[PDB]
Every structure is written in structure tokens, then in C-alpha cells.
């Protein structure tokens, strides 16, 4: 509603998983860009489907 490495143990997870996540994003960058280009067609796509 309102809206070893010395790291604190509560945050180990976030730190360990950040690498793969970043790699994955970088590798799929082109796909994400194409997807963003299709965003203006989304209303037409919705109308054709309804018909």
C-alpha cells in the first residue's frame, strides 16, 4: 500500500545468486529489446484476438 567475503549471513543468498542472474540477463538482451519493440502492437493484437 505504501509503494571469504565479509558479508552479513542474512544476505548470503542474494549475493550468491546475483551472478547467474546477471549473466542470464545479458545473454537475453536482444530478445528483451525485440519484446520491448512489440509493446506498441499489443492493443492491435488484443483486438484481433477478440474478433
Amino acid at each position: 500500500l505504501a509503494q571469504n567475503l565479509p558479508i552479513e549471513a542474512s544476505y548470503h543468498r542474494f549475493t550468491a545468486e546475483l551472478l547467474p542472474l546477471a549473466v542470464n540477463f545479458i545473454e537475453k538482451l536482444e530478445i528483451y529489446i525485440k519484446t520491448i519493440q512489440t509493446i506498441p502492437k499489443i492493443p492491435d493484437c488484443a483486438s484481433n484476438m477478440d474478433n
Binding site: 551472478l19 545479458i26 545473454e27 536482444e30 520491448i36 519493440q37
Partner: protein
């Protein structure tokens, strides 16, 4: 009466309540090469190990590209009306069920009754004429 009037709200509320090889895309390479003078980036792999700082730097560049593209094609932010999609899936499912019920009604009720009547009539007829003719 109070409990009945609050049903819709309850529903809304319930809905809420319920090995690192890096292939860098050409687009990012092209960006890094064009801005190479500005982007002091170390090698992704140093002494055979992954440099996490470089990866994060690459990620930042990638995100800038994404930011640029979103500013061009998604100025207002695209909203996929989740309620619309749920309403459409539910309706089409009902159509499918109606077609199946119709076919089941035709196959298990209507054709079974009709086929029985046809068989009785064909037998009654064959018996009647077999008696009158003494042969098939």
C-alpha cells in the same frame, strides 16, 4: 446483511494475500566498442576466473540499452490487463464445456434412443413379411 455486502472486497483481498560462461550479445559489444574510451572495463575473465565487477558493469550497460528502448517504445509502461485475460480464458472454457455437453447429449442420449427405435422397426418389419412370404 453486512456479510453479504462485503463478499466482493474479500475476494480482492484474497487475491493479493494468496560455471559462469558469459556470451555477450553483438548489440552490447557494439555499445562497449563505441564507448570504449569512456568505459574503463577489465576483462570478464582474469587469471581464468570471473571478474564480478566487470559482469556488473556489463549488466549496467545492458540495462542502459534496455532503458533507452523502453523510453522509445514503452513511455507510459504497457499494462497487461490480467483481469481481462482471466475473463476471456474463463469464457472460452465455458464455450468448450457447452460443445462437449452438446456432443455427449447427441451421442449418449439422442442417437441411442433413435437407433433403438430404428432397430425395432427394422425387426418388426422383417418378421411381418417373413410371416407373409414364408421366406426372407
Amino acid at each position: 446483511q453486512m456479510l453479504k455486502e462485503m463478499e466482493k472486497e474479500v475476494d480482492v483481498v484474497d487475491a493479493v494475500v494468496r560455471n559462469a560462461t558469459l556470451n555477450i550479445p553483438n548489440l552490447l559489444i557494439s555499445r562497449i566498442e563505441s564507448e570504449m574510451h569512456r568505459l574503463q572495463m577489465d576483462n570478464v575473465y582474469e587469471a581464468g576466473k570471473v571478474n564480478l565487477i566487470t559482469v556488473v558493469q556489463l549488466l549496467n550497460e545492458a540495462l542502459k540499452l534496455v532503458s533507452g528502448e523502453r523510453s522509445l517504445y514503452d513511455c507510459k509502461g504497457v499494462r497487461l490487463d490480467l483481469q481481462y485475460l482471466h475473463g476471456k480464458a474463463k469464457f472460452e472454457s465455458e464455450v468448450l464445456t457447452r460443445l462437449r455437453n452438446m456432443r455427449h447429449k447427441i451421442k449418449r442420449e439422442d442417437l441411442v434412443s433413435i437407433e433403438k427405435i430404428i432397430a425395432d422397426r427394422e425387426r418388426e418389419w422383417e418378421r411381418k413379411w417373413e410371416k407373409i412370404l414364408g421366406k426372407c
